[PDB]
Amino acid sequence: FSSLTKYTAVEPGEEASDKNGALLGDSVVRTIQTGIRAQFANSGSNSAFKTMAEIGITQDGTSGKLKIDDDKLTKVLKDNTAAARELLVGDGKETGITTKIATEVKSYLADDGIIDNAQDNVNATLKSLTKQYLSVSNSIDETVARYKAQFTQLDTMMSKL
Amino acid sequence: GTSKTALNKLGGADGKTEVVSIGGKTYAASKAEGHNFKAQPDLAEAAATTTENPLQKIDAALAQVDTLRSDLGAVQNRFNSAITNLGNTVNNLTSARSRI
Amino acid sequence: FTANIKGLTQASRNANDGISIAQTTEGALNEINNNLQRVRELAVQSANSTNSQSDLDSIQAEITQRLNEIDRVSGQTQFNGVKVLAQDNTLTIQVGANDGETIDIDLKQINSQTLGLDTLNVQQKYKVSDTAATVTGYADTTIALDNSTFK
Amino acid sequence: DLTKNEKGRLTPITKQQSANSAKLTAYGTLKSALEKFQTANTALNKADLFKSTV
Secondary structure: OHHHOOOOOOOOOOOOOOOOOOOOOOOHHHHHHHHHHHHHOOOOOOOOOOOOOOOOOOEOOOOOOEOOOHHHHHHHHHHOOHHHHHHHHOOOOOOOHHHHHHHHHHHHHOOOOHHHHHHHHHHHHHHHHHHHHHHHHHHHHHHHHHHHHHHHHHHHHHHHO | OOOOOOOEEEEOOOOOEEEEEEOOEEEOHHHHOOOOOOOOOOOOOOOOOOOOOHHHHHHHHHHHHHHHHHHHHHHHHHHHHHHHHHHHHHHHHHHHHHHO | OOHHHHHHHHHHHHHHHHHHHHHHHHHHHHHHHHHHHHHHHHHHHHHOOOOOHHHHHHHHHHHHHHHHHHHHHHHOOOEOOEOOOOOOEEEEOOOOOOOOOOOEEEEOOOOOHHHOOOOOOOOOOOOOOOOOOOOOOOOOOOOOOOHHHHO | OHHHHHHHHHOOOHHHHHHHHHHHHHHHHHHHHHHHHHHHHHHHOOOOHHHOOO
16 A cells, blocks of 8 residues: 555656656545554454454554564463454454455445446546547547648649749 | 743653743643744643543544545545646647647 | 746646645554554553553653654654644645636644643552651752851 | 647547556556455454364
8 A cells, every 4th residue: 555655746946747646646545545444443342452452463653564563462372362362353243353344345346335436437537538539639630631731732832833 | 042940840641751831831841852932832731640531532533533534535636626627728728739 | 928837837836735745644644543553552451450550651651752753753844845733834726727716725733742642641640658857868068167257 | 840749649648548547457456455355354254263272
């Protein structure tokens, strides 16, 4: 997701830049990132330890990389695996991170899914742009036809002289 | 730029932070140095003792996250509208100059 | 038209500033949500009373200190004069016939320390063990016998 | 004025279609990512595996 951020800032001194970022002009991926990160914050645990606090799963200070504490995670899991069982698995039927992630992904893959709707809108937009390209192409063809008529006229005038 | 000898209150979770009080408001001397007073003449600091009820603080933090993402979406669609308008202007003007 | 060139250039830089605003808002959102995750981690850890209070206080102090560090490094990065958490500024796109309607964006003072999260303390203060007449230490003095009487 | 007109007329809108194609490729990449998360979820959601005492 951090690799999807393409940006080249330009000061007023230099002219306009032709290069455009791959993921720019599009906020749906940012919404997906926010939703995924928020759902990653577990709060439906049956145990009092709703958060993964006791285990030792720590996100990075500036980014979402899990700066996992190997010795802390190891000492906690040798202390008790039951906390891990009751933390994220929960009941195992409906409660749990995996269940909601899978359900929302199954929603996304369908037509009602936000990613599917985004790509449908993308293809509709590019088809409208293809219609615009056809319009510009026929205008270019007409203008080139006039230019070639003028060029042949100039050739005829130079031949007369 | 002038240091004043004055009674300093306790500050921090442990209370060992020696928070200097200036103008009747206690400003944490730890972060007082290196901060521009012009932008924020009266910044908020950790008050005496502690502030309870963390639940409303977490609710405020998540509301801040929500309003920040809303502002980000507003900015996104705003410059998207600006970009499409300027692109339409550019292509219209180049078609016109090609025609002329 | 010569004004068209400068209008187009400033419109392009305004769009670039808007993109920079979006990216720095993403960065700020990432930072503040990392802080929120750490804070809820601390709250869950300190909810139980079995853990030592000194460790909880040390973790609270560390959370406050790197929150201050990240806030100050965010507030000392100002490129092209755009920044949210530091200054209040209004930016309006010029109406040079390039934009149908001019939109004005306000970047106000937005910080999480106003919410009072740093003000929180996990452990309530306990009265210190006081010893009466400890008789320890000294006081530095420079007084001396009077010059006139001694002379 | 042939060169100026040609340079203007070759690529007037192509950047937009290129951006749309890049967006579609990004959608495909994130789709592959979510499939690998499906695989991970299937691997871990098994509640019996935490009962291992070999």
